[PDB]
């Protein structure tokens, strides 16, 4: 146990701030809302962009999934859920399916492309606690993290857990998939993040030193780093190879924790939603707050950066989405 | 939008919006309640009499008023995370088995945790105390000293007088926690037998009082 910490301390040749102290910082990045997506009844708990960078599905606590046309503000789909409380939603990389999960211990997979409307294609059951995050690997398998301190790789065609990932002591709140889609990370309320190998089905690395429960996680676009956000009003950036944290994004002014963390296409911008009604944009290499996305009347709950990186969508508890660009 | 296909997409979106408007009309005219308790309590009996899954939702209508009641099922002991989902509910019906004499302290700790929750401020709690008849034969039959578990029972004053004394001792022990803190939310104790049909009526009355007091505070008339 202490050997790993000693090795991590030894491997820390220098802080990333010193290396990136001489670089030219980016200026005040001003982003204005170009579209407002409204129609949700209750607070919005999750959203996910499409790979086409135009469609996005959002989940509301009223028991509703909405698939929007972000370019034209049109509502492509409105799926009524069987359970009112949903805390996560995912959009398939091919766009043929959408997933959701919530207080019920069920992952609902809906088939968008039907000869019929939208029908629930699968109801994955087997988790003991509430689902907090679900992400599609492809049209056949999905990784879902739940409230019983476990993650699970499922087989949608079969409906049974192909693999289970255990080791977290607190319930898992969010997960993110690597661009290679061969391994992922999961942040739990155990104040730690764990790296899971999808094929091996076992934990590979553990990242600690993040004071409160981790509320959000995302990969750096390179895939060798990932940023976490928790409830102690700080964001961490861990590097997979160094097996430690690189920099810390926090301010003395910020008191409330982070709900969602996302990266830009090039990784130069880290967008973090906060409980203080708005989102902060940070220079990911210098930890300087360059840009604030204000305009939400309630706590921000979900963020998303498109694959092409042109726009960033923010959903919060005022039942409104905003497309900043 | 100028194109024909885009116009048809816009009209489909408008139909979606009309459906969402009807759903909002239904959603505003209903009251959401969170049912909490323990395995030893009679929450399942209460929901059955009134009307690996992680939640069970119950619809009950009284005086043409609709009440959703959400009871979390298979969930871990820690609840500090999903409770954030219930910061906009009308009330929290907390059910306690009064005849256990052993899990009573656990129920008190749970009620203290719920009452002082940061996200549950301005959310009122309705205390249901089941097993009142079971409490009655337990008190009258002896062999289970109430003062043994709670040393302050002997130095306390208000069917048989002993049953009423025990009932009101439990009620006061529950309400001391609510009166210790809070002005934004209130506790509504009740006594419920094994099978009673007045649970929905008293839930309706407590919800009416809760919303009335919230409106009075909103306009500053309290």
């Amino acid at each position, epitope marked *: 146990k202490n050997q790993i910490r000693d090795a991590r301390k030894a491997c820390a040749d220098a802080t990333l701030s010193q290396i990136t102290n001489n670089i030219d910082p980016v200026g005040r990045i001003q982003m204005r809302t170009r579209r407002t997506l409204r129609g949700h009844l209750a607070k919005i708990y999750a959203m996910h962009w499409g790979t086409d960078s*135009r469609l996005l599905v959002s989940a509301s606590q009223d028991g509703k999934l909405i698939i929007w046309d972000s370019y034209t503000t049109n509502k*492509v789909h409105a799926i009524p859920l069987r359970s009112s409380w949903v805390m996560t939603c995912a959009y398939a990389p091919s766009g043929n399916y959408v997933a959701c999960g919530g207080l019920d211990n069920i992952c609902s997979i809906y088939n968008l492309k039907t000869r*019929e409307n939208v029908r629930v294609s699968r109801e994955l059951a087997g988790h003991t606690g509430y689902l907090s995050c679900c992400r599609f690997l492809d049209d056949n398998q999905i990784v879902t993290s739940s409230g019983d301190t476990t993650c699970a790789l499922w087989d949608i065609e079969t409906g049974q857990q192909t693999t289970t990932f255990t080791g977290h002591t607190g319930d898992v709140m969010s997960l993110s998939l690597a661009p290679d889609t061969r391994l992922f990370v999961s942040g739990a309320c155990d104040a730690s993040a764990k790296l899971w190998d999808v094929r091996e089905g076992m934990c590979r690395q553990t990242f600690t030193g993040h004071e409160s429960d981790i509320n959000a996680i995302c990969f750096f676009p390179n895939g060798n780093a990932f940023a976490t956000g928790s409830d102690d009003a700080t964001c961490r950036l861990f590097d997979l190879r160094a097996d430690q944290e690189l920099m810390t994004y926090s301010h003395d002014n910020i008191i409330c924790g982070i709900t969602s963390v996302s990266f830009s296409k090039s990784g130069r911008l880290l967008l973090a939603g906060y409980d203080d009604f708005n989102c902060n944009v940070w220079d990911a290499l210098k930890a300087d707050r360059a840009g604030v996305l204000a305009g939400h009347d309630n706590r921000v709950s979900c963020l998303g950066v498109t694959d092409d990186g042109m726009a960033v969508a923010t959903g919060s508890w005022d039942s409104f989405l905003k497309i900043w660009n | 939008t100028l*194109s024909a*296909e885009d116009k*048809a997409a816009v*009209e*489909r979106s408008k*139909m979606i919006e009309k459906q969402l408007q009807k759903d909002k009309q239904v959603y505003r005219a209903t009251h959401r309640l969170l049912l909490l308790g323990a395995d030893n309590s009679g929450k399942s009996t209460i929901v059955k009499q009134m009307r690996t899954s992680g939640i069970f939702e119950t619809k009950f209508q009284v005086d043409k008023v609709n009440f959703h009641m959400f009871d979390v099922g298979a969930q871990r002991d820690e609840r500090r995370k999903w409770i954030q989902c219930f910061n906009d509910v009308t009330a929290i019906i907390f059910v306690v088995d009064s005849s256990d004499y052993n899990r009573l302290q656990e129920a008190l700790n749970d009620f203290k945790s719920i009452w002082n929750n940061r996200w549950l401020r301005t959310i009122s709690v309705i205390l249901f105390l089941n097993k009142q008849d079971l409490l009655a034969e337990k008190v009258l039959a002896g062999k289970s000293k109430i003062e043994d578990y709670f040393p302050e029972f002997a130095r306390y004053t208000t069917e048989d007088p002993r049953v009423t004394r025990a009932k009101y001792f439990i009620r006061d022990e529950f309400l001391r926690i609510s009166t210790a803190s809070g002005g934004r939310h209130y506790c509504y104790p009740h006594f419920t037998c094994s099978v009673d049909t007045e649970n929905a009526r008293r839930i309706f009355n407590d919800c009416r009082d809760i919303i009335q007091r919230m409106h009075l505070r909103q306009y500053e008339l309290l």
Partner: single-chain antibody, 229 residues
Framework: VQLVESGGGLVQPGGRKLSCSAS????????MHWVRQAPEKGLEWVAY????????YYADTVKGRFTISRDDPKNTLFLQMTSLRSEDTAMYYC??????????????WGQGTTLTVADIVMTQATSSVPVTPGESVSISCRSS???????????LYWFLQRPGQSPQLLIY???NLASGVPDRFSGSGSGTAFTLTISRLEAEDVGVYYC?????????FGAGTKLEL
């Protein structure tokens, strides 16, 4: 999914109602079309009714002569014919459609029922291409104006009608195959000139090929090329 039609027959000039009953899909969520096909001509768009009946569009030739309606609870579509003329003696097809981002309109067609008594123009230069199985086949078409809109989508649809049965959608917007069509059909264009090519050639590919523009609702189908064996 199924859309089966009823009605039609022999009528004196100047006089029916055609019904289209659906079974196998959410009829209320799909817009509906009535499309004609004369024995001596090709396909001809007749009428369109939206999902919620909010917008209804009619053929330029017949506007007050025909009326269209639907009932979702019965999942049925009605076309009432008034003042039937000699030209209104074509086959009538009840075509399913749906319009959202990424949808595939005109995907399913009914079998149809026999009946006997400023818009843009698209002409297919060839009437019939003689080819042999196993060889790539090219079918060309043209439009009176640039068919590509400002959205970047070109609203052109390619249908194949195999002899003895109803047409079935092949291509929509020149870059999207239909649901179950073989992966040997493809489309290309530049706004005015349009071309569908088949790399292989099978026995089932024989039929009549039609091109339609959906940029504007008065729908200009094409002449159609007969793919003779």
């Amino acid at each position: 999914v199924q859309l089966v039609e009823s009605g039609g027959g022999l009528v004196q000039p100047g006089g029916r109602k055609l019904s289209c009953s659906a079974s196998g899909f959410a009829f209320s969520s799909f817009g509906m079309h009535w499309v004609r096909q004369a024995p001596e001509k090709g396909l001809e768009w007749v009428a369109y009714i939206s999902s919620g009946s909010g917008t209804i569009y009619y053929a330029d030739t017949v506007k007050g002569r025909f009326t269209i309606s639907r009932d979702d609870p019965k999942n049925t579509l009605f076309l009432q014919m008034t003042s039937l003329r000699s030209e209104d003696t074509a086959m009538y097809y009840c075509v399913r459609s749906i319009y959202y981002y990424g949808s595939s309109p005109f995907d399913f067609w009914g079998q149809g029922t026999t009946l006997t008594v400023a818009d843009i123009v698209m002409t297919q230069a060839t009437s019939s291409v003689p080819v042999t199985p196993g060889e790539s086949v090219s079918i060309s078409c043209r439009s009176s104006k640039s068919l590509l809109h400002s959205n970047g989508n070109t609203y052109l649809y390619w249908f194949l009608q195999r002899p003895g049965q109803s047409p079935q959608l092949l291509i929509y917007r020149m870059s999207n195959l239909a649901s179950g069509v073989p992966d040997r059909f493809s489309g290309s264009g530049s706004g005015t000139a349009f071309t569908l090519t088949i790399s292989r050639l099978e026995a089932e590919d024989v039929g009549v090929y039609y091109c339609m523009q959906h940029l504007e609702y008065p729908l200009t189908f094409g002449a159609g090329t007969k793919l003779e064996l």
